[PDB]
Design a protein around this ligand. Structure first.
Ligand code: CD
Ligand code: CD
Ligand code: CD
Length: 63
């Protein structure tokens, strides 16, 4: 329920893009791995860096 910004990620509804907590309408304060997963859910949320999903910015070869 809202991230209130000031998270441990980037481009996650904060003072660096959108207005304030605009990402989704239920969750956002998650621990993403890549910038293409913050509000793209390009990969399963929870990746603490270097996951495996090649479909995301982490690489290029599907997940
Ligand atoms: Cd991932
Ligand atoms: Cd990803
Ligand atoms: Cd990743």
């Amino acid at each position: 329920m809202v991230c209130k910004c000031d998270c441990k990620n980037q481009n996650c509804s904060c003072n660096t893009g959108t207005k304030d907590c605009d990402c989704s309408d239920a969750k956002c304060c998650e621990q993403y791995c890549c910038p293409t997963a913050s509000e793209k859910k390009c990969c399963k949320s929870g990746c603490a860096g270097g996951c495996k999903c090649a479909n995301c910015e982490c690489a290029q070869a599907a997940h």
